[PDB]
Design an enzyme around this catalytic site. Structure first.
Site, PDB file in Angstrom:
ATOM      1  N   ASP A 123      58.759-140.830 -74.366  1.00  0.00           N
ATOM      2  CA  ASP A 123      58.255-139.467 -74.228  1.00  0.00           C
ATOM      3  C   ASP A 123      57.053-139.328 -73.281  1.00  0.00           C
ATOM      4  OD1 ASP A 123      58.318-136.688 -74.844  1.00  0.00           O
ATOM      5  OD2 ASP A 123      56.756-137.007 -76.364  1.00  0.00           O
ATOM      6  N   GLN A 127      50.415-135.093 -70.262  1.00  0.00           N
ATOM      7  CA  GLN A 127      49.504-135.032 -71.403  1.00  0.00           C
ATOM      8  C   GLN A 127      49.195-136.400 -72.016  1.00  0.00           C
ATOM      9  OE1 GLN A 127      50.816-131.744 -74.188  1.00  0.00           O
ATOM     10  NE2 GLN A 127      48.793-130.939 -73.634  1.00  0.00           N
TER      11      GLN A 127
END
Ligand SMILES: NC(=O)c1cc([N+](=O)[O-])ccc1NCc1ccccn1
Length: 294
Positions: A123, A127
């Site tokens: 993932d 961020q």
């Protein structure tokens, strides 16, 4: 907890809230992640614990894993800013190429290390790429997805981004390979360059079709086996591949070449982090220091 001093809330994670905290004893400042749940699978505890040993300069260090009161706290090395915030802050002038290159090079070293120890991120996104004042960039949350399945939302109302997801994941492949991380990083590379997300899908099918509209609808020629994937549909529209020079202008041919190898459809053809590090694009790689306003 009680041994800390919640300095501030660093936001809501993909598992739980995250706090910047100070160890009342060691005095060290850390990132404390509260992970969602009624008991916590001990299988996940073992998995997570193995990660405390995955130490590398471009990997956010997992300091401690604390299971108490059937609650799971992850204690991480603290860095002051993430790449998403940095890219927004650099949006007007863009991140200098030497820095984009330095970051990509360091991220690839991080992936190479993780992948050699059979650990996948699954993932990756701006961020969770953290940076410091010394020009270093580090991968955060490596291995957590494997030890915590794949939930649609964080755990409590919050839309998880699909923008960096590899096409094999979107077509329902059940077994991920290290290639999914190279794909995400390629997407991040393109975004640092153009200052705009490469594939900003807002639904799984929109994500897939955006990828198809740019790289062409995949077929058995470029991706053997694709038509037999779980979610593949013979009814997918067939879009022709767009010229790469139109995709990440004005990146030079060394950059475009590497990006194209990171975005190959077939997970097997996709370049590995190790091979990527030897690409001519890194011939003049340096380590510039970013301009960080903290
Ligand atoms: N490990 C970390 O340092 C960290 C962890 C998470 N997180 O969600 O696990 C989020 C952000 C982090 N730092 C970047 C940062 C920190 C403070 C203010 C602004 N930006």
């Amino acid at each position: 907890m009680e041994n800390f001093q919640k300095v501030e809330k660093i936001g809501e994670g993909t598992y739980g809230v995250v706090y910047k905290a100070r160890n009342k004893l060691t005095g060290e400042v850390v990132a404390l992640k509260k992970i969602r749940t009624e008991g916590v699978p001990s299988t996940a505890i073992r998995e997570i614990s193995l990660l405390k040993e995955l130490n590398h300069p471009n990997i956010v260090k997992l300091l401690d894993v604390i299971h108490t009161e059937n609650k799971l706290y992850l204690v991480f090395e603290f860095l002051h800013q993430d790449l998403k915030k940095f890219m927004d802050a650099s949006a007007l002038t863009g991140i200098p190429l030497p820095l984009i290159k330095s970051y990509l090079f360091q991220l690839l070293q991080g992936l190479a290390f993780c992948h050699s120890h059979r650990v996948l991120h699954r993932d990756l996104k701006p961020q969770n790429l953290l940076i410091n004042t010394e020009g270093a960039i580090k991968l955060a949350d490596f291995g957590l997805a494997r030890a915590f399945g794949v939930p649609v939302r964080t755990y409590t109302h919050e839309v998880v981004t699909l923008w960096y997801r590899a096409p094999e994941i979107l077509l329902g492949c059940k077994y991920y390979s290290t290639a999914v991380d190279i794909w995400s990083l390629g997407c991040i590379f393109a975004e640092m360059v153009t200052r705009r997300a490469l594939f900003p899908g807002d639904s799984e099918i929109d994500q897939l079709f955006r990828i198809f509209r740019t790289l062409g609808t995949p077929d058995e020629v470029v991706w053997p086996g694709v038509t037999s994937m779980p979610d593949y549909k013979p009814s997918f529209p067939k879009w022709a591949r767009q010229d790469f020079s139109k995709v990440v202008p004005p990146l030079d041919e060394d950059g475009r070449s590497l990006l194209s190898q990171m975005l190959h459809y077939d997970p097997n053809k996709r370049i590995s982090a190790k091979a990527a590090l030897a690409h001519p694009f890194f011939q003049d790689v340096t380590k510039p220091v970013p301009h960080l306003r903290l």
